Design an enzyme around this catalytic site. Structure first.
Site, PDB file in Angstrom:
ATOM      1  N   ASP A 181       0.808  -1.213   0.000  1.00 36.74           N
ATOM      2  CA  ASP A 181       0.000   0.000   0.000  1.00 36.74           C
ATOM      3  C   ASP A 181       0.846   1.270   0.000  1.00 36.74           C
ATOM      4  O   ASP A 181       0.472   2.260  -0.619  1.00 36.74           O
ATOM      5  CB  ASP A 181      -0.966   0.002   1.187  1.00 36.74           C
ATOM      6  N   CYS A 215      -1.848   0.872 -13.994  1.00 34.74           N
ATOM      7  CA  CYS A 215      -2.090   0.838 -12.554  1.00 34.74           C
ATOM      8  C   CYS A 215      -3.294   1.728 -12.300  1.00 34.74           C
ATOM      9  O   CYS A 215      -4.312   1.588 -12.977  1.00 34.74           O
ATOM     10  CB  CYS A 215      -0.864   1.266 -11.757  1.00 34.74           C
ATOM     11  N   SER A 216      -3.210   2.639 -11.345  1.00 36.59           N
ATOM     12  CA  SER A 216      -4.297   3.595 -11.198  1.00 36.59           C
ATOM     13  C   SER A 216      -4.126   4.782 -12.168  1.00 36.59           C
ATOM     14  O   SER A 216      -5.012   5.067 -12.970  1.00 36.59           O
ATOM     15  CB  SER A 216      -4.433   4.064  -9.750  1.00 36.59           C
ATOM     16  N   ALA A 217      -2.979   5.453 -12.102  1.00 38.86           N
ATOM     17  CA  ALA A 217      -2.652   6.517 -13.054  1.00 38.86           C
ATOM     18  C   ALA A 217      -1.939   6.005 -14.329  1.00 38.86           C
ATOM     19  O   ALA A 217      -1.944   6.681 -15.359  1.00 38.86           O
ATOM     20  CB  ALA A 217      -1.803   7.588 -12.379  1.00 38.86           C
ATOM     21  N   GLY A 218      -1.316   4.830 -14.260  1.00 38.34           N
ATOM     22  CA  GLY A 218      -0.580   4.290 -15.399  1.00 38.34           C
ATOM     23  C   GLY A 218       0.824   4.861 -15.618  1.00 38.34           C
ATOM     24  O   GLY A 218       1.275   5.004 -16.765  1.00 38.34           O
ATOM     25  N   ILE A 219       1.531   5.173 -14.532  1.00 39.01           N
ATOM     26  CA  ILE A 219       2.864   5.761 -14.644  1.00 39.01           C
ATOM     27  C   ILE A 219       3.822   5.252 -13.579  1.00 39.01           C
ATOM     28  O   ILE A 219       5.031   5.170 -13.812  1.00 39.01           O
ATOM     29  CB  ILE A 219       2.828   7.317 -14.584  1.00 39.01           C
ATOM     30  N   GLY A 220       3.280   4.923 -12.409  1.00 40.18           N
ATOM     31  CA  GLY A 220       4.095   4.531 -11.268  1.00 40.18           C
ATOM     32  C   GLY A 220       4.592   3.104 -11.365  1.00 40.18           C
ATOM     33  O   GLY A 220       5.716   2.863 -11.827  1.00 40.18           O
ATOM     34  N   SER A 222       3.380   0.943 -13.354  1.00 36.23           N
ATOM     35  CA  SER A 222       3.357   0.669 -14.771  1.00 36.23           C
ATOM     36  C   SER A 222       4.715   0.974 -15.365  1.00 36.23           C
ATOM     37  O   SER A 222       5.223   0.207 -16.180  1.00 36.23           O
ATOM     38  CB  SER A 222       2.301   1.539 -15.449  1.00 36.23           C
ATOM     39  N   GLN A 262       7.089   7.145 -10.139  1.00 38.45           N
ATOM     40  CA  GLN A 262       6.541   8.274  -9.370  1.00 38.45           C
ATOM     41  C   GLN A 262       7.377   8.773  -8.195  1.00 38.45           C
ATOM     42  O   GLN A 262       7.149   9.873  -7.712  1.00 38.45           O
ATOM     43  CB  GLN A 262       5.115   7.968  -8.885  1.00 38.45           C
TER      44      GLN A 262
END
Length: 299
Positions: A181, A215-220, A222, A262
């Site tokens: 988390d 992922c959620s934003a697609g950058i971290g 991912s 991120q």
């Protein structure tokens, strides 16, 4: 490995945060005009995370071709990835349309539908065989065919049908379920094992469209997944762990989508994954069964 040397040097001098900021400072900045159009506001999950215009995926539809997704095209490695945000309640049909039009074989999901008590993603695939999903807006049918639940990830076989032409395809869904988390795994073994599971499926291969990673934003997470895969591929293509500059690889990737990786934890973890995965790449084929020994099955 010059990267294992750089690794220890960066750790000894505790400069991961500064290295990461160097990356932020140098990264490409390109316009995201389409993403910012008023008609597309409800197609974006985060106001601060947008696909560049030059590398965005266009839906092949007449009324609004916009989706929050970027084609990351890595020339030397000869690998392409689509990075996208976790689908929204109103963009699930768009998401599957993209999978269809881009001819993708795999979908890699690196988050849980609920994290930290909030909804990071819509439930965009069917959870029960007998309850298929219909996306009326893009005319697609989606059916869970089988699941295979392991301790730290789940593989799903899905059938996507174009209700217009009635062609059907098998899509593999790879769901990493245990990204912590707050931090990062801090041991790459299960991440690596998961990556290699994705590779073994054929989803990452040239005969298919690009794998969809989100992922959620697609950058971290991912970004972490794609950065590690590409670095390993490159080390493989010249069997030379030394020529691969991970920071240069990241940055090359940031020309195609902003914000990839991120924070400094994820950066450090990326090095770890690449360094550890290099053992396999370099001839030690037995390191793969060791990663699987420290993984496979437990909640």
């Amino acid at each position: 490995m010059e990267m294992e040397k750089e690794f220890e040097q960066i750790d000894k001098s505790g400069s991961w945060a500064a290295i990461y900021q160097d990356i932020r400072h140098e990264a490409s900045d390109f316009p995201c005009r389409v993403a910012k159009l008023p008609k597309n506001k409800n197609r974006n999950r985060y106001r601060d995370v947008s696909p560049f215009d030059h590398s965005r995926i266009k839906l092949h539809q007449e009324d609004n071709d916009y989706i929050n997704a970027s084609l990351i095209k890595m020339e030397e490695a000869q690998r392409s990835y689509i990075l996208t945000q976790g689908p929204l309640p109103n963009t699930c049909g768009h998401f599957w349309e993209m999978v269809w039009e881009q001819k993708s074989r795999g979908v890699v999901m690196l988050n849980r539908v609920m994290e930290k008590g909030s909804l990071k993603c819509a439930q965009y695939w069917p959870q029960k065989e007998e309850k298929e999903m219909i996306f009326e807006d893009t005319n697609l049918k989606l059916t869970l065919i089988s699941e295979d639940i392991k301790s730290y990830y789940t593989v799903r076989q899905l059938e996507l049908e174009n209700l217009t032409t009635q062609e059907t395809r098998e899509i593999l869904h790879f769901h990493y379920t245990t990204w912590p988390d707050f931090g990062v795994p801090e041991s790459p073994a299960s991440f690596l094992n998961f990556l290699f599971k994705v590779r073994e499926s054929g989803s990452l291969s040239p005969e298919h469209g690009p794998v969809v990673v989100h992922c959620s934003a697609g950058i971290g997470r991912s970004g972490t997944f794609c950065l590690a895969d590409t670095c390993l591929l490159l080390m493989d293509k010249r069997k030379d762990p030394s020529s691969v500059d991970i920071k240069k690889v990241l940055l090359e990737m940031r020309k195609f989508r902003m914000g990839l990786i991120q924070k400094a934890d994820q950066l450090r973890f990326s090095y770890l994954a690449v360094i550890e995965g290099a053992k396999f790449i370099m001839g030690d084929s037995s390191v793969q069964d060791q990663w699987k020994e420290l993984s496979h099955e437990d909640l």
